[PDB]
Amino acid sequence: LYQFNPAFFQTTVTAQILLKALTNLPHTDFTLCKCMIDQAHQEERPIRQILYLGDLLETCHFQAFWQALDENMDLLEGITGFEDSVRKFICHVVGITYQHIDRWLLAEMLGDLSDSQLKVWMSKYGWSADEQIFICXXXXXXXXXXXXXXXXX
Amino acid sequence: YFSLVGLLRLHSLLGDYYQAIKVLENIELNKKSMYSRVPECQVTTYYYVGFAYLMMRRYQDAIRVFANILLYIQRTKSMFQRTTYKYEMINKQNEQMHALLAIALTMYPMRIDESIHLQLREKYGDKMLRMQKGDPQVYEELFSYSCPKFLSEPFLQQLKVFSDEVQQQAQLSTIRSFLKLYTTMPVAKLAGFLDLTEQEFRIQLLVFKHKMKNLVWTSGISALDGEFQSXXXXXXXXXXXXXXXXXXXXXXXX
Amino acid sequence: YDLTTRIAHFLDRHLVFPLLEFLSVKEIYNEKELLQGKLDLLSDTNMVDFAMDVYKNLYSDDIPHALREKRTTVVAQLKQLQAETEPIVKHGFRQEYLDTLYRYAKFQYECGNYSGAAEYLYFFRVLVPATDRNALSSLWGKLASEILMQNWDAAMEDLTRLKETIDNNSVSSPLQSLQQRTWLIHWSLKGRDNIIDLFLYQPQYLNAIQTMCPHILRYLTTAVITNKDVRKRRQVLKDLVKVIQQESYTYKDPITEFVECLYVNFDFDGAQKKLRECESVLVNDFFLVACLEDFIENARLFIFETFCRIHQCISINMLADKLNMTPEEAERWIVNLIRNARLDAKIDSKLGHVVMGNXXXXXXXXXXXXXXXXXXXXXXXXXX
């Protein structure tokens, strides 16, 4: 509706839509929303900034994400569970890309959590510390015969 | 159907991606009516399909539709030759479509084909060489110089978005091409190779990121040591034997 | 090596004196040979600036008669030429004017004022009767003066003006001369991979003027050997070992010949000992001096690569002991080489163990097989 009726473009609603889309990664939500916003609008504040943050998440640069994330950002205050939703995506990626992982590193990637908070996420996905946090004939013959015959022929 | 295709194209030029995709999904209709009425209409439909594929993450569907509209190099590397029946202006449009397809085509497989395309132009051949080189610095410069081609409406393509996305995928492929195959790899060798990539810190990050993608597999990454570790076979062999037989059959039949 | 023969060997005046002054400045201030011969040689000519330098300490004692005569004869010659050129500009003949420009060039050159020698040398451009002789010789001159003023850019320029010029004769060496100048420019400007291509290309069989016959053998040889990035197996084999013509130059300096035979034959220790031996002499070479450290290091890196690719696992300590060069030094060299990314050597000095690597493996071979199958299929399609 905003793309088709430009005068109605609402910055806050657009930003919330994009942020909520990010909370739904690894799904394609965030990418679909981008398909629905033209270049001019993507380049405007704070849409540009939000897309930049999303980019850090998509490219899985988690440390950079948390660093660049203005924790006290206005738009984030009303988006309930935003930070934890992001963590779910991170744990989704971690469960796929690591066999074992340093306890300190995981807490960093999850947004510099206390040991107590880290425990909450390890518990949620069933990860445990080890040494560290524990995370994780006849037919063939016939075929050859045929192939051989074909070759001979 | 032609009205739908034209309308969809207009929407795409001034229109949102998903609605156009839905129109394309309705849009396909028997080949034969189009073939009887004119040569060109089929080519236009193929071009539309290619555009949808380009909008779509997969380049496979568009690769087929474009080749049918225009001749394309086949799997098993045999030339695909298109009919010249369509009116010359239409044929020129088809050639333009083929030029567009190269972008889809490069993603589909391999490797350095421009034989159908004119030898003299460096616009496409140069791009092919840069991809072969595996170094961005040449790739980036190719975009920079042929900035004009990308632009060709300006609002419709304000930011060059698609080309940049494509280039970033293109940069990743070469690293996967080493594709591990080593049980255990020295860190320094990896650093030297990852150093070439623009970010210095990417290998600590760039290497781990690659693992997340899953194009290439890294073992022992993030280790204290710091050195990466890196029936089915029978099936593969059987597959090869099959291909050999197929080639022989075609030879005999010929 | 004896100086008499070296100085004697090079035809060029700049080599004759500039080399002596280099050897003197380059190695030891104290040694007599660089200064005595340069003194005596300068006193044979019209340049009092060089003569003045000789007069200065570390130089032969100043003589009043030598300077006054040179100086006065110069004043006279300059007046003469000035007039003659005045008159030639005013008989309206191109050849005479060209000679005057050339003669002012000669006069300035011998007088040691190089900028002017160049200017008046190229002023003969307009009055050239023909490009090939009037113009190409102008080139040879700008080339001499540019080499001596140390701008090798300009050398390449007049090399492309000369060899770009339409009339070329196969029989004439000047091809040879220009090859030598280009080679020299490349060498002065990783490995160039141009210098060697040039030097290796031909021998006139006539005096170089620009390059010592030994100089071409050594420059070609070392530049080539150090071109790992550029050099083909042929480049080691095709353009040097198999190259019969270049053999002529090579037989001139046999230590270099054996150095190359050693490298090509896989005895890199022998090769590097030759190099260590010659290093002190090669640091005396006026053109080579600046590149010596680079070329030798590159050769060492190439040798390591040859050793390094052929063995999956290496006993580094044993290699250092069995190297014929000190193990610690070898380790240090390897460490220096590695960061550059020249070597993919996986090395811990302390371990003394080195390891370089060039279902997964099985899949690799399978992949290759599939690749070939694809090509075959393509051919079949083409046939159809």
Short mmCIF file of all heavy atoms in Angstrom, two decimals, chain B residues 93-175, unseen atoms left out:
data_model
loop_
_atom_site.label_atom_id
_atom_site.label_comp_id
_atom_site.label_asym_id
_atom_site.label_seq_id
_atom_site.Cartn_x
_atom_site.Cartn_y
_atom_site.Cartn_z
N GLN B 93 15.84 -8.39 -30.41
CA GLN B 93 15.32 -8.38 -29.05
C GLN B 93 15.74 -9.67 -28.35
O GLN B 93 16.12 -9.66 -27.18
CB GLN B 93 13.80 -8.25 -29.05
N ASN B 94 15.67 -10.77 -29.08
CA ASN B 94 16.06 -12.08 -28.59
C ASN B 94 17.54 -12.13 -28.24
O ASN B 94 17.93 -12.75 -27.26
CB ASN B 94 15.73 -13.17 -29.61
N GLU B 95 18.36 -11.50 -29.07
CA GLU B 95 19.79 -11.40 -28.83
C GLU B 95 20.06 -10.60 -27.56
O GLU B 95 20.94 -10.95 -26.77
CB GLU B 95 20.49 -10.74 -30.02
N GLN B 96 19.29 -9.53 -27.36
CA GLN B 96 19.41 -8.73 -26.15
C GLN B 96 19.05 -9.59 -24.95
O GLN B 96 19.69 -9.52 -23.89
CB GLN B 96 18.51 -7.50 -26.22
N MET B 97 18.01 -10.40 -25.12
CA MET B 97 17.56 -11.30 -24.07
C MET B 97 18.64 -12.32 -23.73
O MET B 97 18.84 -12.65 -22.57
CB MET B 97 16.28 -12.03 -24.50
N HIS B 98 19.32 -12.81 -24.76
CA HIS B 98 20.43 -13.75 -24.60
C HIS B 98 21.58 -13.11 -23.85
O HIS B 98 22.23 -13.76 -23.02
CB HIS B 98 20.90 -14.25 -25.97
N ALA B 99 21.85 -11.85 -24.15
CA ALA B 99 22.88 -11.10 -23.45
C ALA B 99 22.52 -10.97 -21.98
O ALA B 99 23.37 -11.10 -21.11
CB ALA B 99 23.05 -9.72 -24.08
N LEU B 100 21.24 -10.72 -21.71
CA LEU B 100 20.76 -10.64 -20.33
C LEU B 100 20.92 -11.99 -19.64
O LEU B 100 21.29 -12.06 -18.47
CB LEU B 100 19.29 -10.21 -20.30
N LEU B 101 20.63 -13.05 -20.38
CA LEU B 101 20.67 -14.42 -19.88
C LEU B 101 22.08 -14.80 -19.45
O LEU B 101 22.25 -15.44 -18.41
CB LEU B 101 20.17 -15.39 -20.94
N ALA B 102 23.09 -14.41 -20.22
CA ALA B 102 24.45 -14.67 -19.76
C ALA B 102 24.58 -14.52 -18.25
O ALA B 102 25.26 -15.32 -17.61
CB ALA B 102 25.42 -13.74 -20.47
N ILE B 103 23.94 -13.51 -17.68
CA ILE B 103 24.02 -13.29 -16.24
C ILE B 103 23.43 -14.46 -15.46
O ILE B 103 23.99 -14.91 -14.46
CB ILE B 103 23.30 -11.99 -15.82
N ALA B 104 22.25 -14.90 -15.89
CA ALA B 104 21.64 -16.12 -15.39
C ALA B 104 22.46 -17.35 -15.78
O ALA B 104 22.63 -18.28 -14.99
CB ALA B 104 20.21 -16.26 -15.90
N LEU B 105 22.96 -17.34 -17.01
CA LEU B 105 23.67 -18.48 -17.59
C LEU B 105 24.96 -18.82 -16.85
O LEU B 105 25.27 -19.99 -16.65
CB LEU B 105 23.96 -18.23 -19.07
N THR B 106 25.71 -17.80 -16.45
CA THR B 106 26.97 -18.02 -15.77
C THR B 106 26.73 -18.74 -14.45
O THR B 106 27.48 -19.64 -14.07
CB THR B 106 27.70 -16.69 -15.49
N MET B 107 25.67 -18.34 -13.76
CA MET B 107 25.29 -18.97 -12.50
C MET B 107 24.90 -20.43 -12.70
O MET B 107 25.23 -21.29 -11.88
CB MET B 107 24.13 -18.20 -11.85
N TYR B 108 24.23 -20.73 -13.81
CA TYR B 108 23.74 -22.08 -14.05
C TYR B 108 24.87 -23.12 -14.13
O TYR B 108 24.75 -24.20 -13.55
CB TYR B 108 22.90 -22.13 -15.33
N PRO B 109 25.94 -22.82 -14.86
CA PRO B 109 27.05 -23.78 -14.89
C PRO B 109 28.41 -23.22 -15.33
O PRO B 109 29.10 -22.59 -14.53
CB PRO B 109 26.56 -24.85 -15.88
N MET B 110 28.80 -23.46 -16.58
CA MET B 110 30.13 -23.11 -17.07
C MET B 110 30.16 -22.99 -18.60
O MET B 110 29.23 -23.43 -19.27
CB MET B 110 31.15 -24.15 -16.60
N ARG B 111 31.24 -22.42 -19.14
CA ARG B 111 32.33 -21.84 -18.36
C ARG B 111 32.79 -20.53 -18.98
O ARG B 111 32.61 -19.45 -18.40
CB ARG B 111 33.50 -22.82 -18.27
N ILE B 112 33.39 -20.63 -20.16
CA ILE B 112 33.86 -19.46 -20.90
C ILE B 112 33.38 -19.53 -22.34
O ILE B 112 34.16 -19.79 -23.26
CB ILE B 112 35.40 -19.35 -20.88
N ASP B 113 32.08 -19.31 -22.53
CA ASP B 113 31.46 -19.39 -23.85
C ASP B 113 30.95 -18.03 -24.33
O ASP B 113 30.23 -17.34 -23.62
CB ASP B 113 30.31 -20.40 -23.83
N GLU B 114 31.34 -17.66 -25.55
CA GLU B 114 30.92 -16.42 -26.12
C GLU B 114 31.00 -16.55 -27.58
O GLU B 114 30.97 -15.58 -28.33
CB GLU B 114 31.79 -15.27 -25.61
N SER B 115 31.17 -17.80 -28.02
CA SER B 115 31.24 -18.21 -29.39
C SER B 115 30.07 -17.71 -30.28
O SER B 115 30.26 -17.17 -31.35
CB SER B 115 31.31 -19.73 -29.50
N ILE B 116 28.85 -17.91 -29.79
CA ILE B 116 27.68 -17.34 -30.44
C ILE B 116 27.77 -15.82 -30.39
O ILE B 116 27.46 -15.14 -31.36
CB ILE B 116 26.38 -17.80 -29.76
N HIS B 117 28.20 -15.31 -29.24
CA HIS B 117 28.41 -13.88 -29.05
C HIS B 117 29.63 -13.40 -29.84
O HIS B 117 30.57 -14.15 -30.06
CB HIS B 117 28.59 -13.56 -27.57
N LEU B 118 29.60 -12.14 -30.27
CA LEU B 118 30.70 -11.59 -31.04
C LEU B 118 31.99 -11.55 -30.22
O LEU B 118 31.99 -11.18 -29.05
CB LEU B 118 30.36 -10.18 -31.55
N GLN B 119 33.09 -11.94 -30.86
CA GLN B 119 34.40 -11.97 -30.22
C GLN B 119 34.92 -10.59 -29.80
O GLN B 119 35.53 -10.44 -28.75
CB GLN B 119 35.43 -12.65 -31.13
N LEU B 120 34.68 -9.59 -30.65
CA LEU B 120 35.30 -8.28 -30.50
C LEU B 120 34.94 -7.53 -29.22
O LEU B 120 35.81 -6.91 -28.61
CB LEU B 120 34.97 -7.40 -31.72
N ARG B 121 33.68 -7.59 -28.81
CA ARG B 121 33.25 -6.84 -27.63
C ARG B 121 33.94 -7.33 -26.36
O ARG B 121 34.02 -8.54 -26.12
CB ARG B 121 31.73 -6.92 -27.47
N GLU B 122 34.42 -6.39 -25.55
CA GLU B 122 35.05 -6.72 -24.28
C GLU B 122 34.07 -6.61 -23.11
O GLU B 122 34.42 -6.89 -21.97
CB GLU B 122 36.26 -5.81 -24.03
N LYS B 123 32.85 -6.19 -23.41
CA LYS B 123 31.83 -5.97 -22.39
C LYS B 123 31.47 -7.25 -21.64
O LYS B 123 31.28 -7.24 -20.43
CB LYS B 123 30.58 -5.34 -23.00
N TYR B 124 31.36 -8.35 -22.38
CA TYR B 124 30.94 -9.62 -21.82
C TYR B 124 32.14 -10.54 -21.63
O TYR B 124 32.27 -11.21 -20.60
CB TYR B 124 29.89 -10.29 -22.72
N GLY B 125 33.03 -10.55 -22.62
CA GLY B 125 34.23 -11.36 -22.55
C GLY B 125 35.13 -10.91 -21.41
O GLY B 125 35.71 -11.72 -20.70
N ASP B 126 35.23 -9.59 -21.24
CA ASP B 126 36.03 -9.04 -20.15
C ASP B 126 35.46 -9.48 -18.81
O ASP B 126 36.20 -9.84 -17.90
CB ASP B 126 36.07 -7.51 -20.24
N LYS B 127 34.13 -9.46 -18.71
CA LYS B 127 33.45 -9.87 -17.49
C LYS B 127 33.74 -11.34 -17.20
O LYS B 127 33.96 -11.73 -16.06
CB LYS B 127 31.95 -9.64 -17.60
N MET B 128 33.73 -12.15 -18.26
CA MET B 128 34.02 -13.57 -18.13
C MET B 128 35.45 -13.80 -17.63
O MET B 128 35.69 -14.67 -16.80
CB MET B 128 33.81 -14.28 -19.47
N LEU B 129 36.39 -13.01 -18.15
CA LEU B 129 37.79 -13.13 -17.74
C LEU B 129 37.98 -12.81 -16.26
O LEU B 129 38.75 -13.47 -15.56
CB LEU B 129 38.67 -12.23 -18.60
N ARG B 130 37.28 -11.79 -15.80
CA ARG B 130 37.38 -11.29 -14.43
C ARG B 130 36.86 -12.34 -13.46
O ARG B 130 37.43 -12.55 -12.39
CB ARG B 130 36.59 -9.99 -14.27
N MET B 131 35.77 -13.00 -13.84
CA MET B 131 35.22 -14.09 -13.05
C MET B 131 36.23 -15.24 -12.99
O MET B 131 36.42 -15.86 -11.94
CB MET B 131 33.90 -14.59 -13.65
N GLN B 132 36.88 -15.50 -14.12
CA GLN B 132 37.90 -16.54 -14.21
C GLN B 132 39.08 -16.22 -13.30
O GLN B 132 39.65 -17.11 -12.67
CB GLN B 132 38.37 -16.71 -15.65
N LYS B 133 39.46 -14.95 -13.26
CA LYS B 133 40.59 -14.51 -12.45
C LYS B 133 40.35 -14.78 -10.97
O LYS B 133 41.26 -15.17 -10.25
CB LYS B 133 40.86 -13.02 -12.68
N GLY B 134 39.12 -14.56 -10.53
CA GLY B 134 38.76 -14.78 -9.14
C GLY B 134 39.13 -13.62 -8.24
O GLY B 134 39.04 -13.71 -7.02
N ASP B 135 39.55 -12.51 -8.85
CA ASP B 135 39.91 -11.32 -8.10
C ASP B 135 38.86 -10.23 -8.32
O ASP B 135 38.55 -9.87 -9.45
CB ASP B 135 41.29 -10.81 -8.52
N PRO B 136 38.33 -9.71 -7.22
CA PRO B 136 37.27 -8.69 -7.27
C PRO B 136 37.74 -7.39 -7.91
O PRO B 136 36.98 -6.78 -8.67
CB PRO B 136 36.95 -8.46 -5.79
N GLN B 137 38.96 -6.96 -7.61
CA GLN B 137 39.45 -5.71 -8.07
C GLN B 137 39.14 -5.52 -9.56
O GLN B 137 38.73 -4.39 -9.96
CB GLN B 137 40.95 -5.59 -7.81
N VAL B 138 39.35 -6.49 -10.45
CA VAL B 138 38.96 -6.44 -11.78
C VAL B 138 37.45 -6.41 -11.99
O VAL B 138 36.94 -5.59 -12.79
CB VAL B 138 39.53 -7.63 -12.55
N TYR B 139 36.69 -7.21 -11.21
CA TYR B 139 35.25 -7.30 -11.27
C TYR B 139 34.65 -6.00 -10.92
O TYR B 139 33.77 -5.54 -11.62
CB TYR B 139 34.74 -8.39 -10.33
N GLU B 140 35.20 -5.37 -9.90
CA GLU B 140 34.57 -4.11 -9.38
C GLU B 140 34.70 -3.05 -10.46
O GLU B 140 33.72 -2.40 -10.78
CB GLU B 140 35.22 -3.65 -8.06
N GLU B 141 35.91 -2.96 -11.02
CA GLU B 141 36.25 -2.06 -12.09
C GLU B 141 35.43 -2.25 -13.31
O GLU B 141 35.26 -1.29 -14.07
CB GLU B 141 37.72 -2.20 -12.47
N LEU B 142 35.05 -3.50 -13.59
CA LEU B 142 34.18 -3.83 -14.75
C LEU B 142 32.82 -3.24 -14.53
O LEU B 142 32.26 -2.59 -15.44
CB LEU B 142 34.08 -5.36 -14.96
N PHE B 143 32.29 -3.35 -13.29
CA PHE B 143 31.02 -2.67 -13.02
C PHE B 143 31.14 -1.13 -13.18
O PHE B 143 30.22 -0.48 -13.63
CB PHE B 143 30.49 -3.00 -11.62
N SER B 144 32.22 -0.57 -12.66
CA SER B 144 32.52 0.86 -12.64
C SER B 144 32.58 1.48 -14.01
O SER B 144 32.06 2.52 -14.28
CB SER B 144 33.86 1.15 -11.93
N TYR B 145 33.33 0.79 -14.93
CA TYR B 145 33.36 1.21 -16.34
C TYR B 145 32.11 1.06 -17.07
O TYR B 145 31.66 1.98 -17.74
CB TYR B 145 34.44 0.45 -17.10
N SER B 146 31.47 -0.10 -16.92
CA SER B 146 30.20 -0.34 -17.64
C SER B 146 29.02 -0.14 -16.80
O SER B 146 28.07 -0.99 -16.71
CB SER B 146 30.17 -1.75 -18.22
N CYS B 147 29.07 1.03 -16.17
CA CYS B 147 28.10 1.55 -15.31
C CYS B 147 26.95 1.90 -16.15
O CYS B 147 25.83 1.79 -15.70
CB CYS B 147 28.66 2.74 -14.54
N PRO B 148 27.21 2.37 -17.36
CA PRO B 148 26.14 2.81 -18.27
C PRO B 148 25.19 1.68 -18.66
O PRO B 148 23.98 1.90 -18.72
CB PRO B 148 26.91 3.29 -19.50
N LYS B 149 25.73 0.50 -18.92
CA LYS B 149 24.91 -0.64 -19.33
C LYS B 149 23.92 -1.04 -18.24
O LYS B 149 22.77 -1.36 -18.53
CB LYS B 149 25.80 -1.83 -19.69
N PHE B 150 24.38 -1.02 -17.00
CA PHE B 150 23.55 -1.39 -15.86
C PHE B 150 22.36 -0.44 -15.70
O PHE B 150 21.25 -0.86 -15.39
CB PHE B 150 24.37 -1.42 -14.57
N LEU B 151 22.61 0.85 -15.91
CA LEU B 151 21.59 1.87 -15.69
C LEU B 151 20.38 1.71 -16.62
O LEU B 151 19.24 1.87 -16.18
CB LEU B 151 22.19 3.27 -15.87
N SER B 152 20.63 1.38 -17.88
CA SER B 152 19.55 1.21 -18.84
C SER B 152 18.64 0.06 -18.44
O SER B 152 17.41 0.15 -18.52
CB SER B 152 20.11 0.98 -20.24
N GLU B 153 12.78 4.92 -15.87
CA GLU B 153 13.76 3.85 -16.01
C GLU B 153 14.87 3.97 -14.97
O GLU B 153 15.20 3.00 -14.29
CB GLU B 153 14.37 3.86 -17.42
N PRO B 154 15.42 5.17 -14.84
CA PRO B 154 16.50 5.41 -13.88
C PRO B 154 16.02 5.16 -12.45
O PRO B 154 16.73 4.55 -11.66
CB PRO B 154 16.82 6.89 -14.07
N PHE B 155 14.81 5.61 -12.14
CA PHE B 155 14.21 5.35 -10.84
C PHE B 155 14.02 3.85 -10.69
O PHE B 155 14.29 3.27 -9.63
CB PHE B 155 12.86 6.07 -10.71
N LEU B 156 13.61 3.21 -11.78
CA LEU B 156 13.30 1.79 -11.79
C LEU B 156 14.55 1.04 -11.37
O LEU B 156 14.47 0.03 -10.67
CB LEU B 156 12.85 1.34 -13.18
N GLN B 157 15.70 1.54 -11.81
CA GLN B 157 16.96 0.97 -11.38
C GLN B 157 17.81 2.11 -10.83
O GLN B 157 18.78 2.54 -11.45
CB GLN B 157 17.68 0.29 -12.55
N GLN B 158 17.40 2.65 -9.69
CA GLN B 158 18.18 3.69 -9.02
C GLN B 158 19.53 3.23 -8.46
O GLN B 158 20.53 3.93 -8.58
CB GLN B 158 17.35 4.33 -7.90
N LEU B 159 19.55 2.05 -7.83
CA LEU B 159 20.71 1.60 -7.06
C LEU B 159 21.55 0.46 -7.63
O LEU B 159 22.46 -0.03 -6.96
CB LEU B 159 20.29 1.26 -5.63
N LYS B 160 21.27 0.02 -8.86
CA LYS B 160 21.97 -1.14 -9.41
C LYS B 160 21.74 -2.34 -8.49
O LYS B 160 22.62 -3.18 -8.29
CB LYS B 160 23.47 -0.85 -9.53
N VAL B 161 20.59 -2.55 -7.87
CA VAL B 161 20.65 -3.58 -6.80
C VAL B 161 21.08 -5.01 -7.23
O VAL B 161 21.95 -5.68 -6.59
CB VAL B 161 19.32 -3.67 -6.04
N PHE B 162 20.50 -5.48 -8.33
CA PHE B 162 20.69 -6.86 -8.77
C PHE B 162 22.13 -7.20 -9.11
O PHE B 162 22.64 -8.27 -8.74
CB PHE B 162 19.78 -7.17 -9.96
N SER B 163 22.81 -6.29 -9.81
CA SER B 163 24.17 -6.55 -10.24
C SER B 163 25.09 -6.73 -9.04
O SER B 163 25.92 -7.64 -9.01
CB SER B 163 24.68 -5.41 -11.12
N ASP B 164 24.93 -5.87 -8.03
CA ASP B 164 25.75 -5.96 -6.84
C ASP B 164 25.50 -7.29 -6.14
O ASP B 164 26.45 -7.99 -5.72
CB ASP B 164 25.45 -4.80 -5.89
N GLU B 165 24.22 -7.67 -6.05
CA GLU B 165 23.94 -8.94 -5.36
C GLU B 165 24.64 -10.09 -6.10
O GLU B 165 25.29 -10.96 -5.49
CB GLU B 165 22.44 -9.19 -5.29
N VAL B 166 24.55 -10.05 -7.43
CA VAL B 166 25.11 -11.11 -8.25
C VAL B 166 26.62 -11.18 -8.07
O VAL B 166 27.19 -12.27 -7.95
CB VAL B 166 24.79 -10.90 -9.74
N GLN B 167 27.27 -10.03 -8.03
CA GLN B 167 28.72 -9.99 -7.88
C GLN B 167 29.14 -10.59 -6.55
O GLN B 167 30.10 -11.38 -6.48
CB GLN B 167 29.23 -8.55 -7.99
N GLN B 168 28.40 -10.26 -5.48
CA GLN B 168 28.77 -10.81 -4.18
C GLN B 168 28.65 -12.34 -4.22
O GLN B 168 29.55 -13.08 -3.76
CB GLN B 168 27.89 -10.24 -3.08
N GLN B 169 27.63 -12.89 -4.86
CA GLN B 169 27.61 -14.36 -4.97
C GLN B 169 28.84 -14.89 -5.75
O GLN B 169 29.48 -15.90 -5.38
CB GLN B 169 26.32 -14.84 -5.63
N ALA B 170 29.17 -14.17 -6.82
CA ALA B 170 30.24 -14.56 -7.73
C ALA B 170 31.58 -14.61 -7.01
O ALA B 170 32.40 -15.48 -7.29
CB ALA B 170 30.30 -13.61 -8.91
N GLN B 171 31.82 -13.66 -6.11
CA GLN B 171 33.07 -13.62 -5.38
C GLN B 171 33.25 -14.88 -4.53
O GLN B 171 34.33 -15.46 -4.49
CB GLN B 171 33.14 -12.38 -4.49
N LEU B 172 32.19 -15.34 -3.88
CA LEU B 172 32.27 -16.52 -3.01
C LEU B 172 32.66 -17.84 -3.71
O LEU B 172 33.40 -18.67 -3.15
CB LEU B 172 30.96 -16.71 -2.24
N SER B 173 32.29 -18.02 -4.97
CA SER B 173 32.43 -19.35 -5.58
C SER B 173 33.86 -19.93 -5.60
O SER B 173 34.06 -21.13 -5.37
CB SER B 173 31.85 -19.34 -7.00
N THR B 174 34.85 -19.08 -5.86
CA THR B 174 36.23 -19.54 -6.00
C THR B 174 36.80 -20.19 -4.73
O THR B 174 37.54 -21.18 -4.82
CB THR B 174 37.16 -18.39 -6.42
N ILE B 175 36.48 -19.63 -3.57
CA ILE B 175 36.96 -20.19 -2.31
C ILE B 175 36.41 -21.60 -2.08
O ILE B 175 37.15 -22.49 -1.65
CB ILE B 175 36.56 -19.29 -1.12
#
